[PDB]
Design a protein around this ligand. Structure first.
Ligand code: SF4
Ligand code: SF4
Length: 55
């Protein structure tokens, strides 16, 4: 799983780009569904602040 850390500025750019729709808007920051994430790294590639990190 990747997890979006506290650097997220809630820009929303990563949500459309997840190939398996694992990202949604949450309170404070966006959230990854760890039961769907397949570690592709796409969200980190479109993140301006590089908040998604592999855990
Ligand atoms: S790593 Fe890939 S599968 Fe996991 S949330 Fe980011 S874009 Fe979606
Ligand atoms: S692209 Fe980065 S800052 Fe923008 S919502 Fe996704 S994780 Fe947060």
């Amino acid at each position: 799983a990747y997890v979006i850390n506290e650097a997220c500025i809630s820009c929303g750019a990563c949500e459309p780009e997840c190939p398996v729709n694992a990202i949604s808007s949450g309170d404070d920051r966006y959230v990854i569904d760890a039961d769907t994430c397949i570690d592709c790294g796409a969200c980190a590639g479109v993140c301006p602040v590089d908040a998604p990190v592999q855990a």
